[PDB]
Tab-separated table of N, CA and C in Angstrom:
chain	number	residue	atom	x	y	z
A	978	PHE	N	-19.545	18.976	2.046
A	978	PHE	CA	-19.820	19.996	1.038
A	978	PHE	C	-20.940	20.930	1.477
A	979	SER	N	-21.979	20.388	2.110
A	979	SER	CA	-23.095	21.208	2.561
A	979	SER	C	-22.835	21.885	3.901
A	980	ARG	N	-21.714	21.588	4.554
A	980	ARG	CA	-21.404	22.146	5.864
A	980	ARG	C	-20.244	23.127	5.852
A	981	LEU	N	-19.221	22.887	5.040
A	981	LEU	CA	-18.028	23.718	5.019
A	981	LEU	C	-17.948	24.524	3.728
A	982	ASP	N	-17.101	25.549	3.760
A	982	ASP	CA	-16.760	26.293	2.559
A	982	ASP	C	-15.925	25.418	1.626
A	983	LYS	N	-15.933	25.778	0.339
A	983	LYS	CA	-15.300	24.943	-0.681
A	983	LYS	C	-13.790	24.848	-0.486
A	984	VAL	N	-13.134	25.974	-0.192
A	984	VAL	CA	-11.683	25.966	-0.037
A	984	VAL	C	-11.280	25.258	1.257
A	985	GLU	N	-12.110	25.352	2.299
A	985	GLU	CA	-11.810	24.645	3.541
A	985	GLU	C	-12.078	23.152	3.408
A	986	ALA	N	-13.179	22.781	2.750
A	986	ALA	CA	-13.488	21.371	2.543
A	986	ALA	C	-12.565	20.722	1.523
A	987	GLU	N	-11.857	21.530	0.727
A	987	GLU	CA	-10.941	20.992	-0.271
A	987	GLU	C	-9.812	20.204	0.385
A	988	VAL	N	-9.294	20.693	1.515
A	988	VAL	CA	-8.221	19.993	2.219
A	988	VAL	C	-8.707	18.652	2.762
A	989	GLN	N	-9.896	18.639	3.374
A	989	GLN	CA	-10.448	17.409	3.936
A	989	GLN	C	-10.721	16.378	2.848
A	990	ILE	N	-11.332	16.814	1.744
A	990	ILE	CA	-11.630	15.874	0.672
A	990	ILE	C	-10.347	15.432	-0.024
A	991	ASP	N	-9.310	16.279	-0.027
A	991	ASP	CA	-8.015	15.878	-0.561
A	991	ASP	C	-7.393	14.775	0.281
A	992	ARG	N	-7.468	14.916	1.608
A	992	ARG	CA	-6.972	13.870	2.499
A	992	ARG	C	-7.730	12.563	2.283
A	993	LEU	N	-9.057	12.659	2.148
A	993	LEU	CA	-9.886	11.476	1.940
A	993	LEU	C	-9.536	10.768	0.633
A	994	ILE	N	-9.392	11.530	-0.456
A	994	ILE	CA	-9.136	10.886	-1.739
A	994	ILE	C	-7.707	10.363	-1.814
A	995	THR	N	-6.750	11.009	-1.133
A	995	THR	CA	-5.399	10.454	-1.101
A	995	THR	C	-5.381	9.115	-0.380
A	996	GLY	N	-6.113	9.014	0.735
A	996	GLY	CA	-6.226	7.729	1.411
A	996	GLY	C	-6.884	6.661	0.554
A	997	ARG	N	-7.962	7.027	-0.147
A	997	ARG	CA	-8.673	6.045	-0.961
A	997	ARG	C	-7.839	5.573	-2.150
A	998	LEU	N	-7.138	6.491	-2.823
A	998	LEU	CA	-6.246	6.089	-3.907
A	998	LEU	C	-5.079	5.246	-3.409
A	999	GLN	N	-4.558	5.537	-2.210
A	999	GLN	CA	-3.514	4.682	-1.649
A	999	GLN	C	-4.020	3.261	-1.429
A	1000	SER	N	-5.226	3.131	-0.867
A	1000	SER	CA	-5.802	1.807	-0.641
A	1000	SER	C	-6.050	1.070	-1.954
A	1001	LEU	N	-6.559	1.786	-2.960
A	1001	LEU	CA	-6.820	1.174	-4.259
A	1001	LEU	C	-5.533	0.709	-4.927
A	1002	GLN	N	-4.465	1.508	-4.819
A	1002	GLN	CA	-3.181	1.122	-5.393
A	1002	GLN	C	-2.617	-0.119	-4.713
A	1003	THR	N	-2.746	-0.197	-3.384
A	1003	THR	CA	-2.285	-1.387	-2.673
A	1003	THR	C	-3.063	-2.626	-3.103
A	1004	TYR	N	-4.383	-2.483	-3.273
A	1004	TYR	CA	-5.197	-3.603	-3.740
A	1004	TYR	C	-4.783	-4.049	-5.137
A	1005	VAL	N	-4.509	-3.090	-6.027
A	1005	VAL	CA	-4.114	-3.420	-7.394
A	1005	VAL	C	-2.779	-4.158	-7.404
A	1006	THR	N	-1.829	-3.706	-6.579
A	1006	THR	CA	-0.531	-4.374	-6.503
A	1006	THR	C	-0.663	-5.804	-5.983
A	1007	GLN	N	-1.478	-6.003	-4.939
A	1007	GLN	CA	-1.686	-7.353	-4.415
A	1007	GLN	C	-2.349	-8.257	-5.451
A	1008	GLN	N	-3.310	-7.711	-6.201
A	1008	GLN	CA	-3.954	-8.480	-7.261
A	1008	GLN	C	-2.960	-8.866	-8.346
A	1009	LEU	N	-2.034	-7.962	-8.676
A	1009	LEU	CA	-1.019	-8.270	-9.680
A	1009	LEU	C	-0.091	-9.390	-9.214
A	1010	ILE	N	0.301	-9.369	-7.934
A	1010	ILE	CA	1.152	-10.438	-7.401
A	1010	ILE	C	0.429	-11.780	-7.451
A	1011	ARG	N	-0.845	-11.792	-7.044
A	1011	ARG	CA	-1.624	-13.025	-7.094
A	1011	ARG	C	-1.783	-13.521	-8.526
A	1012	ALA	N	-1.955	-12.596	-9.474
A	1012	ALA	CA	-2.079	-12.977	-10.877
A	1012	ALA	C	-0.793	-13.601	-11.400
A	1013	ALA	N	0.361	-13.062	-10.995
A	1013	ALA	CA	1.635	-13.653	-11.402
A	1013	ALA	C	1.797	-15.065	-10.847
A	1014	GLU	N	1.419	-15.265	-9.581
A	1014	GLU	CA	1.507	-16.601	-8.990
A	1014	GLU	C	0.589	-17.592	-9.702
A	1015	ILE	N	-0.640	-17.168	-10.010
A	1015	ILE	CA	-1.573	-18.034	-10.725
A	1015	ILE	C	-1.071	-18.328	-12.135
A	1016	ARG	N	-0.414	-17.357	-12.778
A	1016	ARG	CA	0.171	-17.584	-14.098
A	1016	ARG	C	1.257	-18.653	-14.053
A	1017	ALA	N	2.126	-18.595	-13.039
A	1017	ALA	CA	3.161	-19.620	-12.898
A	1017	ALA	C	2.552	-20.998	-12.646
A	1018	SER	N	1.528	-21.059	-11.789
A	1018	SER	CA	0.868	-22.334	-11.519
A	1018	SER	C	0.178	-22.879	-12.764
A	1019	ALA	N	-0.395	-21.991	-13.578
A	1019	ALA	CA	-1.045	-22.415	-14.812
A	1019	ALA	C	-0.035	-22.945	-15.818
A	1020	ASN	N	1.152	-22.334	-15.878
A	1020	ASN	CA	2.203	-22.864	-16.746
A	1020	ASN	C	2.637	-24.256	-16.304
A	1021	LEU	N	2.769	-24.464	-14.989
A	1021	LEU	CA	3.103	-25.797	-14.487
A	1021	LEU	C	2.007	-26.807	-14.820
A	1022	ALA	N	0.742	-26.399	-14.682
A	1022	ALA	CA	-0.372	-27.285	-15.012
A	1022	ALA	C	-0.402	-27.610	-16.499
A	1023	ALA	N	-0.065	-26.635	-17.346
A	1023	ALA	CA	-0.009	-26.879	-18.783
A	1023	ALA	C	1.091	-27.870	-19.130
A	1024	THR	N	2.248	-27.754	-18.470
A	1024	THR	CA	3.315	-28.728	-18.687
A	1024	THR	C	2.889	-30.123	-18.238
A	1025	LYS	N	2.183	-30.211	-17.104
A	1025	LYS	CA	1.691	-31.502	-16.628
A	1025	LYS	C	0.683	-32.108	-17.600
A	1026	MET	N	-0.211	-31.275	-18.143
A	1026	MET	CA	-1.161	-31.716	-19.163
A	1026	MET	C	-0.450	-32.227	-20.406
B	978	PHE	N	3.800	17.143	20.084
B	978	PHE	CA	2.654	17.147	20.988
B	978	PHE	C	2.818	18.161	22.114
B	979	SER	N	4.043	18.380	22.579
B	979	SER	CA	4.298	19.306	23.673
B	979	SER	C	4.592	20.727	23.210
B	980	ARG	N	4.714	20.961	21.906
B	980	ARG	CA	5.057	22.276	21.379
B	980	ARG	C	3.891	22.985	20.708
B	981	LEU	N	3.053	22.266	19.972
B	981	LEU	CA	1.949	22.866	19.240
B	981	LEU	C	0.617	22.426	19.834
B	982	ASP	N	-0.413	23.225	19.571
B	982	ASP	CA	-1.748	22.936	20.065
B	982	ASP	C	-2.400	21.854	19.202
B	983	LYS	N	-3.480	21.268	19.722
B	983	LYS	CA	-4.152	20.143	19.087
B	983	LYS	C	-5.140	20.564	18.002
B	984	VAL	N	-5.082	21.813	17.544
B	984	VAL	CA	-5.938	22.271	16.454
B	984	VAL	C	-5.122	22.645	15.215
B	985	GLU	N	-3.791	22.550	15.274
B	985	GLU	CA	-2.961	22.717	14.085
B	985	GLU	C	-1.912	21.629	13.887
B	986	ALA	N	-1.505	20.910	14.936
B	986	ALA	CA	-0.449	19.909	14.814
B	986	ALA	C	-0.924	18.611	14.179
B	987	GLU	N	-2.242	18.424	14.055
B	987	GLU	CA	-2.765	17.194	13.476
B	987	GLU	C	-2.368	17.047	12.015
B	988	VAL	N	-2.184	18.161	11.303
B	988	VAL	CA	-1.753	18.103	9.908
B	988	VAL	C	-0.331	17.558	9.805
B	989	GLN	N	0.578	18.080	10.636
B	989	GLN	CA	1.966	17.626	10.606
B	989	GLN	C	2.081	16.169	11.026
B	990	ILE	N	1.371	15.782	12.091
B	990	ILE	CA	1.463	14.385	12.500
B	990	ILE	C	0.778	13.482	11.479
B	991	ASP	N	-0.254	13.976	10.786
B	991	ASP	CA	-0.888	13.209	9.720
B	991	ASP	C	0.087	12.939	8.584
B	992	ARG	N	0.844	13.968	8.191
B	992	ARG	CA	1.848	13.800	7.144
B	992	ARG	C	2.918	12.802	7.568
B	993	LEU	N	3.360	12.890	8.827
B	993	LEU	CA	4.380	11.969	9.325
B	993	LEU	C	3.882	10.525	9.343
B	994	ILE	N	2.655	10.304	9.825
B	994	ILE	CA	2.114	8.947	9.897
B	994	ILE	C	1.934	8.372	8.497
B	995	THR	N	1.429	9.184	7.559
B	995	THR	CA	1.244	8.701	6.193
B	995	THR	C	2.574	8.334	5.547
B	996	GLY	N	3.612	9.145	5.774
B	996	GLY	CA	4.923	8.811	5.235
B	996	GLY	C	5.493	7.525	5.807
B	997	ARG	N	5.338	7.322	7.119
B	997	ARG	CA	5.871	6.107	7.731
B	997	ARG	C	5.128	4.863	7.251
B	998	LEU	N	3.801	4.949	7.099
B	998	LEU	CA	3.063	3.824	6.524
B	998	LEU	C	3.435	3.581	5.067
B	999	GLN	N	3.751	4.644	4.318
B	999	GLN	CA	4.212	4.459	2.945
B	999	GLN	C	5.521	3.680	2.901
B	1000	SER	N	6.469	4.039	3.772
B	1000	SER	CA	7.743	3.321	3.815
B	1000	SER	C	7.548	1.869	4.241
B	1001	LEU	N	6.676	1.641	5.227
B	1001	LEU	CA	6.410	0.282	5.687
B	1001	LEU	C	5.792	-0.571	4.585
B	1002	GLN	N	4.854	-0.004	3.821
B	1002	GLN	CA	4.221	-0.778	2.761
B	1002	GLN	C	5.184	-1.036	1.609
B	1003	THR	N	6.100	-0.098	1.347
B	1003	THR	CA	7.145	-0.356	0.358
B	1003	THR	C	8.024	-1.528	0.782
B	1004	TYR	N	8.387	-1.572	2.069
B	1004	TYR	CA	9.158	-2.701	2.587
B	1004	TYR	C	8.390	-4.011	2.450
B	1005	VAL	N	7.087	-3.984	2.742
B	1005	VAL	CA	6.265	-5.189	2.644
B	1005	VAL	C	6.205	-5.690	1.204
B	1006	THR	N	6.045	-4.770	0.247
B	1006	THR	CA	5.996	-5.156	-1.162
B	1006	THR	C	7.316	-5.773	-1.618
B	1007	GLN	N	8.443	-5.185	-1.199
B	1007	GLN	CA	9.743	-5.762	-1.540
B	1007	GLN	C	9.907	-7.156	-0.943
B	1008	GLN	N	9.424	-7.345	0.289
B	1008	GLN	CA	9.471	-8.664	0.912
B	1008	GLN	C	8.635	-9.675	0.140
B	1009	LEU	N	7.468	-9.253	-0.357
B	1009	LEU	CA	6.634	-10.147	-1.161
B	1009	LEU	C	7.336	-10.572	-2.447
B	1010	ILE	N	8.013	-9.631	-3.114
B	1010	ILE	CA	8.720	-9.967	-4.354
B	1010	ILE	C	9.838	-10.967	-4.081
B	1011	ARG	N	10.617	-10.717	-3.023
B	1011	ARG	CA	11.688	-11.647	-2.678
B	1011	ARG	C	11.136	-13.005	-2.262
B	1012	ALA	N	9.965	-13.024	-1.619
B	1012	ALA	CA	9.334	-14.287	-1.257
B	1012	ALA	C	8.938	-15.086	-2.485
B	1013	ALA	N	8.396	-14.413	-3.503
B	1013	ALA	CA	8.032	-15.111	-4.734
B	1013	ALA	C	9.261	-15.703	-5.414
B	1014	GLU	N	10.356	-14.936	-5.460
B	1014	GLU	CA	11.585	-15.449	-6.064
B	1014	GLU	C	12.135	-16.648	-5.292
B	1015	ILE	N	12.142	-16.560	-3.959
B	1015	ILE	CA	12.644	-17.656	-3.134
B	1015	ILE	C	11.744	-18.880	-3.262
B	1016	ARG	N	10.432	-18.669	-3.404
B	1016	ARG	CA	9.505	-19.782	-3.590
B	1016	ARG	C	9.770	-20.515	-4.899
B	1017	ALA	N	10.001	-19.765	-5.981
B	1017	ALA	CA	10.327	-20.401	-7.257
B	1017	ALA	C	11.642	-21.170	-7.175
B	1018	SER	N	12.653	-20.575	-6.532
B	1018	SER	CA	13.937	-21.258	-6.386
B	1018	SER	C	13.809	-22.508	-5.523
B	1019	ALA	N	12.972	-22.454	-4.488
B	1019	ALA	CA	12.781	-23.608	-3.619
B	1019	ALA	C	12.042	-24.727	-4.339
B	1020	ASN	N	11.082	-24.379	-5.199
B	1020	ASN	CA	10.416	-25.404	-5.996
B	1020	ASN	C	11.387	-26.064	-6.970
B	1021	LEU	N	12.273	-25.270	-7.580
B	1021	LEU	CA	13.307	-25.847	-8.439
B	1021	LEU	C	14.239	-26.756	-7.643
B	1022	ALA	N	14.589	-26.344	-6.422
B	1022	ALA	CA	15.432	-27.168	-5.562
B	1022	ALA	C	14.737	-28.469	-5.188
B	1023	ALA	N	13.427	-28.416	-4.950
B	1023	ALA	CA	12.670	-29.627	-4.655
B	1023	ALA	C	12.645	-30.567	-5.849
B	1024	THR	N	12.518	-30.015	-7.058
B	1024	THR	CA	12.572	-30.849	-8.256
B	1024	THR	C	13.937	-31.514	-8.408
B	1025	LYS	N	15.014	-30.766	-8.142
B	1025	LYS	CA	16.356	-31.348	-8.189
B	1025	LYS	C	16.531	-32.419	-7.121
B	1026	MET	N	15.963	-32.183	-5.936
B	1026	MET	CA	16.019	-33.141	-4.837
B	1026	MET	C	15.304	-34.431	-5.208
């Protein structure tokens, strides 16, 4: 921001934020899969209890 | 690489690489879902066994 013009730095910061949102979305999806697996294991543990 | 200079072609190759990684991660996510389903079916098969 302090080195480039706003319209020129807009493309670079757009690339950066697209990468960061992609990484965050992948993390959220992996967390959801792990949560589903833990939910199934908890149901099995509840049946055992 | 042999047609355009290295000060403008990076955008096009960046778009291509990002698209290919997107397709690869979609394949990985589908594989994870099928793995979870096969794991549940295999646990049921073990219980029947």
